[model samples]
Each structure stands twice: as structure tokens, then as C-alpha cells.
Target chain A: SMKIDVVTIFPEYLQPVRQSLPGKAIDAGLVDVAVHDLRRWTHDVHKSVDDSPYGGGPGMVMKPTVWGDALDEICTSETLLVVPTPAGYPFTQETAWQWSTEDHLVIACGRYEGIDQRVADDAATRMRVREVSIGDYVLNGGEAAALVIIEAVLRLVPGVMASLLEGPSYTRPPSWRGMDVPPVLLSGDHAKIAAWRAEQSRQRTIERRPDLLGFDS
Target chain B: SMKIDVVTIFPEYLQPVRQSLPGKAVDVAVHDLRRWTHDVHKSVDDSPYGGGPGMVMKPTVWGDALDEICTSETLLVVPTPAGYPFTQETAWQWSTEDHLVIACGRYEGIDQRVADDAATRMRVREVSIGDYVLNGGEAAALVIIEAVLRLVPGVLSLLEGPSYTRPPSWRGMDVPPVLLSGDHAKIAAWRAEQSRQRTIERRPDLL
Candidate 1:
């Protein structure tokens, strides 16, 4: 089972992860997930995880110490460390594919002006580190990005997608509505259906994600 | 207050939005968000909406129905056409700013397959729209995104910092370990200290 550890200030806020869509995957024994409160790692009376930017900024910046410890403890060689921010690389299907292969993952959910760059730099040496953006927009923290990544990647898991009658077919148009399944799928035409899905996947990627097209041969 | 309306096949799946962090904002009436099932709008489904291999997809092509349904109900002043997937950029700004009006259309969130087909054919207008690797780690969702966005990064008041001393003087340290070990008394003391320290550091300049 894949394991994901989330480090956040408010661990209670992540309870939904235990009861939501990812919960289904967990119940099926496809993965294990838990949240670690960053507050738990504090060593001072203030339990302060953030501070004003050194040079000066509107919002606070998360302290490096708290993030440093959180990263050190939760991450392993197999872990993929993800930080969600507007400035990060856009999250996509390719990212989902890459992450599904890992055994462990740690997510750093940042707030304020973002986490200390030092913490990120240090964590990069041991595992896959990515600063992912859900879109061009920004959210308050990386929690949502973490959730999006979890769902997409979990769905891609080998045994997880096996329950459905037609594997990976739901990713396409036929199962979209009550509408008819693609004619090729029913035509007993395996080659045609495969080609159709490929074409559709390519078309969808180009129309929705033009950047992905750049990686195409 | 921000008003968000989501249309999905599985409405019950979104119940968490009303229970989690976003629920806090919902409780305070900071936002009026609701989820609708696409099946409820049978009239909105048909023709181009269902002509494609996907059912709900073709109907989403009926931009007129989708827009009318959303706007007629709430009169969104700034209707973002073709609602994009939730983003931090959208969340961060919306949390502190004016009301956010959203509508989640049925189908693939937004059509990524057809490029300029419907708009060009119908002379219609247009609008526009993470990660880890690990085991057992739950993915973050839109509800969580909305929740984190609502909690102001630094607006939690001096008392909210968790110790008697301002975080700055902590030498870039975290709250005392006692607070983390689940020791209630120490946690309270740390919070008190943080409050006093924050008041002094932040408001010394204030008063």
C-alpha cells in the first residue's frame, strides 16, 4: 500500500481525507494515509511556525525549523516530497504517473509567504521534490494540491483501477454520460478502440494541456 | 460572502466541503456554497450535450443552458465562463476579497478535447478557467483548498501564536516540545507565553 504523510499546523483539518474519496482507496487496502501536525514538532513555548519576511512582506513566512524537522522525519529515500504553491510546476497526469510508483510520500502544506527555501533545499537531496501548482492560481496552502494529487495518482494505481469492468475506460468519453459508449469499444474492434482512446487522449491533452504536448515525440 | 455552486454526478461526495475547514467559514456565513446534481437539470441535457461519446459532455456544450442556469439563480456579476479547476491563485485572493461566484459544470470539469469548435460554430462568447509520492497518503481536495484559503496566513491575532513570546524572538524555533507531546498544561502555558510575547513584539510598535 502507498503511504502518504501530511505535515500541517492543523491536523484536524485533514480528517476529511480519512472519510473522502481517498478513503475508498484506503478501505480497499490500496493505500495508507495519515497526517502529522507540525505543531507537534515545536521546541519553544511559542510554537511559532511562521514569521514576517526578513526584508519585509505583507504576510508571514513559515519557519525553516518546523518545516525542516517535519521533512526530515516523514521523508525516506522512496518518498516523494511535494510542495504546493502558485509558483510551482503545474500538477498534471504525468506527475500522477511518476508519483504512483513511489512507496512513500510526504507533503508540506505551506501558508503565509510560503516555507523557508532552506527547508525545501535540504529536503531535495533525499527524494523526489516537486513544487506543484494546481493551476495558474494560488490557494492558501498545499493541502488542496495534496488532495488533488492523491486522487489522481491513487486512481492510477495498478490494482485500484482493476475493479471497473473496462480498465481505464472511464478516463475517456464513452463512460462520460448516459450516452452511448464509443462505437469502437462495442464494435469488438480492440485496435480501433485503442487508437480512438490514444487520439482522444492526445486531443484532450493538447486542448486542455498544451504544455504536455511539448513532451510528445 | 462568496457563493459557490458545484454540479457533479456524485453530490454526496462533496458533503465533506460542508463539514471540514471550509465548514468553519460556512458556519460563520462567510460563504454560501452548495452542490447540485446534474441529473436534476434534465432539461439541460440533450442534443449536442449527449451527442458525443460522453453523455454529460455534449450537454456542457450547451453553454447557454449552463450560463443561464448559473446566472439566473445568483446573477453573478463577474461570471467566470468555462470554470477552471480550483487553483491556489483563485483561492488565495478569493479568501480575503469580494464574493466569489462559481458554477461547476457537468462533464470533464472543462472540455479539453474540443478546441474552439462550439464557440466558432455558434458565434458564442468564451470564458476561461500538487503533489507527492508516497504510500497511504491521502490526496488533498477542493474542500481542503477552500479551508486553508479562509484561514488568514498571519491574521490569527497575537494570542493565536501559541506561546507567550513573539515568534521572532524564538530564534527561528518552534513551540516548546511540551506542547507537542499532548501535555495539556504545557500547551496552555506555551499559548499564554506566545500571546504575551506577540503582544509585546507586535504591539510595542502598536502602542
Candidate 2:
């Protein structure tokens, strides 16, 4: 089982971890998850984890000391530290597959502007630190990205028997609200059924996400 | 303010709605998708008709719930990897809409007819958050809601340059003298240059 530690400002934002597949994975001993508040390591009276950026910016940057303390205590030489950021390399299914095999993972969720760069730079001397962006956009903080990344990686762990870009699906009633399951699916022929699904999957991929195909002109 | 409704099997997964910025700035309503299921199991999914690896959400139940929730003014956003990639521009565009209904699918996915049928009466936009797989759209919904709501003028509060907080120096690294020089113009120039340089180094596509 893989061990994952998520450090965030709002641990509540990660509440979904205990209710979804990640939670099931924990129960089945396929993975272990722990959510820690970044403020916990703070010694200040306010227990603050962020301060205004050094150069000047619209938002505060998470204090490096706080993250440094948390990671130093939570991570081992084998831990892979994942920092979610808008500027990091794109996170993909391939990244998930690679990380799923790791023995330990520490995901640090930075809020406001972001955490100081040195936290990652310093940790790199002793461990692997990956700064990954879930998508092209930005969020208020890294909690959402952490949740997204954790779900993506944990599902791929062995025994998770994990999973794809599937095509449209239909269930019973054959007919619903005047719409019927594609006739081919009801043809009672596996060959035709598989063929129709394959084409539908490809067509849907092309129409909705042609980039996935890397189709050339 | 905008009107946003999220339908999911695990409404608990969306509890952050009331505890986060979106709830404070927008009128968000999170409903359990199974609330509309009438069976003893309160079932909302079944085996795919064409024979597949996972269960597919039944369209009949989805239709009943969506019909009662959506109006002609609603913009339906379904989170699916097969859908178009969702970007910051998409988030900005959706922020201006009057109302939104985000239907989250679990297992294999909801019947296609749900989105296709709803498209007849209202706008249906299927969005993918990224390239990786999720257990369901619930997490994607959280991502989308956070992204979209933050752009709503004052909901709350940048490919920002690297940041440093107090202490000015730590771990053998010192804050650049330019930031501590007390010259606002010099600091501003240094910040912008750092921002551009970091972007170029990490995400040249943005250029």
C-alpha cells in the first residue's frame, strides 16, 4: 500500500478523500492517506502560514519555514514530494501511473500566491520533488489540485485494478424520454456491439477531444 | 451573483460548497443524485447495455432529476474527460452566465442522452478538467466550481513569480537585495522580470 500525506491550509477542502474511491482504497489497504494543516507547524501567535510576497504581489505567499518544517517531519528519503502549481509541468495519466508505484508521496497544497521556491529547491537535495499543474487554469489554492492528483494517482495503484476516456453508455429501459439505446447495442451480437462501441468511442473522441488523437492535417 | 447547482451521488464530497468562497459569493445548491431514485436500493446505475467494464448511470433517473432542476436559462456543465478541455477562458465565460447546473457522473458515466436531451432545451457544455482519470466528476466539479467562482468579481480573492515571505533569508538562501532596496519601482520591475522569466522557463506555451 502506498502512503500519501497532504498538507493544506483548508483540510476541509480535502474531505472528499475519505468518502470516495480514495477512502475505499484506504479501507482495503491499497493506500493510506493523511491530511495535515500547514498551520500546525507554525509557532507564531496567529498560527499564520502565509505572508505577503517578498517582491510584491496581489496575494500572500506561503511561508517556506512552515512547509519546510512539515515536509522535514513527514517525508522520508523515499518520499516523492508533489507540489501543485499553475506554472509547473502538466500532470497527466502518465504521471499518475508513474507515481502510483511510489512507496510514499507528500502533496503540499499552497494557498494564496504559492509557497516560497526554496522549499522545493532545498528538498530536492534529499528527495524527488515534482511541481505539477493539473490543467491550464489556476485555482484559489492547491487543495483542489491535490484532491484531483490524489484521486488520479491512487486509482492506478495495484489492486485498484484501475482504469479511460470511455464512450457514451446506456442502461436498461432500452427507451427513455423517447430516446433508445443505439440499436447495435441491442442487436445481441458481441462482434457488432464491440465494433459499434469502438467506433463510437473514436468518433466521440475526435468530435469532443481531437487533441487526444493528435490527428494531423 | 450567480446561481449554481451541483448534482452528485456523494453530496458530502461537495460539503465545501457551503464552507468555501463559492458558497459565500454565489447561490450554490448541492443535491444528492440518488435523491431522485425511487428503488429500495435507491439505485442510480446499472450494467451497460452494450456490455462494458463498469456500470452506467441510468438516463431515466438522471432525466427526472435534471428536468426538475434545469430551466431554459440554465447552462449544463458535465465534467467528462471525453469533453473539451476546460481552461481559464472557459471559467471566465461561465462566470458570466446567469445560472449553471453541473451534473456529475460516477462509475462509467451517465447516459449520453441526458446531455443530448438537455441540449434541446438549454445549453450543454461537457468539460474536462485535465488529462488524468478521476473516480468521478465530483472532484472535477469541485475544481470547476472553485475556478469559476473565483472569477465572479468579488467572490474572493496569478502565474505569479516565485514568492518569499518574512525572515528575508533562510536555509542559506537570502531574499534578493532588489526586493529589500525600498525602491517600489525597482521592486516592481524585478517582480515582472521574474514573472516573465519563470513563465518562459516553466510554461513557454503561455507566451
Candidate 3:
């Protein structure tokens, strides 16, 4: 079974993970998900988990010491570290597909301005580390982004999704409020329906996200 | 000061709103889109007109829910994979809006006409948080909400300051020996150079 662990300051933000599709996947024994408090690793009297940026910026940087301790405690050689940051690679369906096959994921949720650059940089010494961005915009922090990534990845886990695993589709009440299911689906021609669905997905992608298209010169 | 409303089937997913910084800065309200369905079962999704695997959110529910939410001055934001990229600039623009209504799409997507019809009444903008899709838009709205509300003045005064407590030392690493040097001219120069080096190294996109 694949394992997912989240390290974040706001354990409260991770609550929805227990009720959604990810929760279902976990309940079916297809995956294991856990949330750990970043503060758990700090040894300070005040539980101060953030420190000043070395030079200067708008927000506090998550202290490297606590992150290091957390990583040292929970991370394994097999773990693939997923660090959510604005300055990172784009997260996509392809990424989710790749993550579905992983044995374990250690997601580091950066808060405040960001983690101490060294903590992220040094984690590479022991395990695989990839910094991923959920999108172009920012959030209060990385918990929601982690939740999004977790939900997307869990859907692709083995047998986690039964009927929900397919692409663009529909159901009963074929005709509703003047809207009718395409006639090709009613034709009982599997090959034609497959071609139609492929074109539909491609056309929709083109109109919506032309960047994903493989264009001919 | 700012108004934000969410029309979602999974209002439970948005419970965190009332407890966050965004909750304090914006006057927020939630409307269950499922309530607008005319059926006794209160169904909000149906099979797509074209053959597909997953359900698409029906337009009827969205239509009625939106009919009551959108006003002449309201800014309608519909989250989908097929919209303009949301940026820091988008967050800034949204903060300026007096009324912002977010329609969270679940299932394959909301019927295309929901947005097209809403356009006849209010300023509608389709925005995507990232290239990736989620189980629904409620999660995305939370992200947008935090990013926008934090920009409101007085919301982050004490919470956000350059660097943090100048402990001068921690775990053998120092915050900055020079910052402690207390040389104002030297500190200003170091800060400028650090910002320049970082922008150049990671985000020359800005340059």
C-alpha cells in the first residue's frame, strides 16, 4: 500500500482529508494518510517553530532546525519528498499518475514566507525531493495545496475508485430539461463512441488549455 | 469590508472559512447549491449531454442559485480548469471587489450555460487556481480567499513583518550577524542585495 504523510502547522486545515475521497481510499485499505504537527519536532519552551529570514523579506521563514528534525524522524530512504512552494515545478495530472505508483510520499507544507532554503536543499542528501507548485497563485499556506495534491493522487490508487475511475461520462435521465445525451452513445457502437470521446476531450482541452496540446508545426 | 459568498454542494468542506484570517476580513456567507434543485431528491448533477464517465453539475441548480446571488455590482467568479490563470494580480483585483460570489463546480464540471447565462447579469470571470483539477472548487476558493483577504490592509500588520524575532542565534545558525551589527546603512544594503540575488536566481521571470 502507498503511504502519504503531511507535515504542517495547521492540523485543523487537514480535517477535510478525513471525509472526502481520500478518506474513502484510506478506509478501503488502499492507502495510508497521516498528518503531523511541525511543532512536534521543536524543543523550545515557547514552541517557536519559525525564525527570521537570513537577509530579509515580508514574512517569517519556517525554521530549518525543526524541519530537519521532522524529516529525520519521519522520512525514509524510500520516501519521495513533495515540497509545496510557489517556486517549484507545475503539478499536473501526469504528476498524480506518477505519484500513484510511489511507495511513500512525505509532503512538506511550507508556511509563513517559506521554509528555510537549506532544509529543503539538505533533505536531498537522504531522499528524493521535488518542489511542486499547485498553481500560479498563492494561498495562506501549503495545507490546502497539500490537500489538493493528496486528493488528486489518492483517486488514482489501485482499486480506490470503482465506477468513478473513467473519463468524461454521464448517467440516468439521459434527457433533462431539453439537454440530451449525444446520439453516438445511444448507437451501441463502441468504436465510434471511443473516437467521439477522444475528440471531445481534445477539443475541450484546446478551448480551455491550449498549452497542453501537442501542436503540429 | 469585502463580501464573499460560496455556492457549493459540499459546504462542510468550507467550514474552515469562519476560523481563518479571510473570515475576519471579509463578510462571508455560504449557500448550498443543492438546495436550488427542483427535484424531491435534490439532485444537482446529471449525465453530460455527450457521453462521459463522470457526472456533470447540472445548470438548473447553478442557474437558480446564481440568480439570487449575483447583483449588478457583484463580481462573479466561477472556478474551472478552463479559465485565466489566477495570479497575485488576480488576488489584488478580487480584494477590490465590493461583492464577490464564487460558484464551486463539482463533478465533471458545471453545465457550460451556467456561466454564459450569468454573464448577461453581472461581470463574470472564470478563474483557475492552477493547471491541476481538484475534487471540487471549494478547496480552490479557500486558497483564493486566504490570498485575497491577507492583502486587505490592517489584516496582517503585526502578523507579517520582514524576517522575524531577531534572536541573533538559533541552533548554531545566526539570523544575520550583520543585522545585529546595528549599522543601518549596512543592513539596508544587505537586504537589497539578498532580494536581488534571490529574484535573479529563482524568479528571473520578474526581470
Candidate 4:
């Protein structure tokens, strides 16, 4: 079971993650997940985690000290540290696959204007750091994006389910709406099914997400 | 206020939409919206809307009946027509605006084998149409997309608030984190203080 650590102000929000599909994976021992409130790491009753931006922009930026303390205690050398924000690289299926294989995953959900840049810079020195976005939309919190990443990645982990043999095999083809299931799949021809799937993937990518095939250049 | 109607088989799934921010807008009379089950239009269902392959799919294939009833009831019917899908540019401006809209025609949620031929044709139509559809037949469902698009422009009527208070008015620049993240009670107390600060600095008469 992979281990997941989340640093956030609202620990209650993590309850849904634990109760949702990903929670089921954790309960089945396919993954170990826990939420750590950043406030808990601070000693002050008013344990504020943000301060005014140095040059002054708009909203308050999160303080580095609280974030550093939370990260130092929760993350390990091998942990994959993710910062969910619009400033980060867009998250995708490819990155999700890579993260699922990691020994541990730690996500920091920043609020207000966002955490100070130093916290992210420091974490990057030792851990694999990624700033990821679910889409181009804005959210009040990053918890939802973190949840989405965890759920998609956990589904790919080995032995997470009873029958791994045909789990991926019979799964719905990505864009199989209204089109006939390829004749090869119905033909029960193993080689032909594999060929048909490859062609289907290419066709689907070209039609829907040509970018998935990468820039032609 | 604008009026909107939605058609869906799983009408219960839309509870959150009817209860969330958009719902709040409806409550406040910013818009008028209602949800209709697709089954009501079954007499007109099952023929092709596009005439390519597979069944016509959902409320759209049922056409005239869906339109006649909705237009008669709704203030304006901005059918979430698939041939022309919503875009991000459509969403940003919509966020602030208000409109009477309706979201119907949902047939993409069925399983693969049942959906294969129709899905491929839909994808081909999407490329030509420029909209994204989701898996589990849930991709870009009309109701969700239309609701999301309402967050954009040209949809709402502007009302008086901040921008009209002063000449060469100071814009409502970003505020301190304390204002955004402080406890609710603390924020309530601080609201008057912040407003006075802005008024004194920008629009003395407004205070």
C-alpha cells in the first residue's frame, strides 16, 4: 500500500477522500493515507499561516515557516511532494501514473493567495516536487484537485483489486460512445483485439486530444 | 431574472446544482431555473438528430416537443446544443452575468458497448463542433457545462455596488489575507473597518 500525506487547514475535508473511492483503496490496504492540519504544527493560538506579500500584490500569501515545519515532519527523502495550484504544470494521466509508483506522496493544499515560494523551493531540494493543476478553473481550495489526482493514480496500483488479470482488459475503451465495439474485440481474436485497441487509441487521440500525441514538430 | 430549464434522466444527480452557487443565484432571483426529466419527451425520442448512425439519442432527438414546451415556459432557451459547445472564453465572462438558460440533450452516459457507435459519431461531431465530452457518459453533460458557463460574461445584468461610488474610481484591488481567511465573526467585525479605510482613501463622500 502506498502512503499519502496531505497538509491542509481543513482536515475535515479529508474525510470525504477517506470515505470516497480512494478511501476504499486505503481501507483495503492498497494505500495508507492521512491528513495533517498545518495549524496543528503551529504553537500560536492564532496560528496564522500567511503574511502580506513582500512587494504587495493582492491577497495574503502563506508563511514559509508553517509550511516548512509541516513538510519536514511529514515528508521523507523518497516522498513525491505535490503542490496543487494554477501556477504549476497541468496534471495529466501520464504524471498520475508516475506518482502512483512512488513510495510516498505528500500534497500541500495552499489557500488564500497561495503559499510562499520558499516553501516550495526548499521542498524541491530533496524531494521530487510537482506543482499540478486539474484544469484551468479556479477553486477556493486545492483539496479537490489533490483528491482527483489520488483517486486516478490509486486505480493503477498493482494488486489493489481482486482480479488484476482482466481488470484493465475488459474496461471501457476511452471514447467508445455510439460506435460499434470493434469487430476484433467481438471476434475474440487476441492479436486483432490488441491491434484494434492501438488503432482506436490513435484515432481517439487524433480526434479528441491530438495534443496527447504530442506536437508534430 | 432569467429562466432556465434542464432535461435529464438522472434528475436526482442535479441536486447539488440546484443547491449550490447557481442554485443560490436562483434563490436570490438572479435567474429562474428548473429541471425536467427526459422521459417526459419519450414519444419523440430514439430517432437521429444528426442522421449519421445509431439512435438520435436523448432529448435532442426528441426535438420539436422538447423545444415547444421549453420555449413556452422558459424566458429564453439557450439550449446546450452539441453542434456548438460552450468554451472557456464563454465561461469567464458568464461568471458575472445572468441569463435564462436551459440544458437538455443528455445521451453520453451509457456503457461502452451500448454507446460505442454513437460515441464515435459524437466525437467526430465534437471535433467539427469544438466541445469536449466525458467518459462514463458524463463528459460535459449539458447541465453541468451550462451551469459552469454561467460564470462567464453576457449572461448577467450588472447592478450597483463598488465601481460607481467615485470619479476616476480606485479599483477593488486585492485585500489582505486576514480579510479573506480570518474567522467569520472576526471578518464581520473587520468588514466596516476595511470599507471605511477604502472609502477614506478613495471615495470620501461614499463613507
- Model 4 TM-score (2 dp): 0.52
In terms of lDDT, which candidate is stronger, 2 or 3? 2
Q: Which of the two, 1 or 3, has more DockQ?
A: 3
Q: Is the docking of candidate 3 incorrect, acceptable, medium or high quality?
A: acceptable
Runs in model 2 deviating more than 4 A are: A16-18, A161-165, A215-217, B17-19, B23-25, B157-159, B181-201, B204-207
- Displacement of residue A70 (Cα, Å) in model 3 is 1.7
Model 1 DockQ vs. reference: 0.10
Candidate 1 residue B36 C-alpha distance from true site, Å: 8.1
Off by over 4 Å in 3: A161-210, A213-217, B17-19, B23-25, B157-207
Error in Å for residue B123 of model 2: 0.8
Task: Give the local distance difference test score of model 2.
Answer: 0.84
Model 2, A1-217: lDDT tens digits are: 7988999877766654456888889989998888897788999899988888776667888888888899999998899999999878779898999998999999988874778888988899899999889998879888888889988888889898112356788888888889888999988899999888788878877877765677631
lDDT of 4 by residue, B1-207 (tens): 333344333343332333223433432221111222244534322432112223323322323324343332232222211222333444454444343333333322112232222332222122111222221112123333434544534332111111111111112223344544537676554545645564454334333
Error of model 4, residue B104, in angstroms: 15
Per-residue C-alpha lDDT of model 1 across residues A107-138, encoded as one tens digit per residue:
88877257865566667766778876655454
Clashes of each: 36, 0, 5, 33
Report the C-alpha displacement of residue B115, candidate 2, in angstroms. Answer: 0.9
Scoring the B chain of model 3 against the true B chain gives a TM-score of 0.85
In model 3, residue pairs whose N, Cα or C atoms come closer than 3 Å (at least 3 residues apart or on different chains), thus clashing, are A168-B52, A168-B53, A169-B52, A169-B53, A170-B52
By lDDT, who's the top model here? Answer: 2
Which sequence of candidate numbers ranks them by lDDT, best first?
2, 3, 1, 4
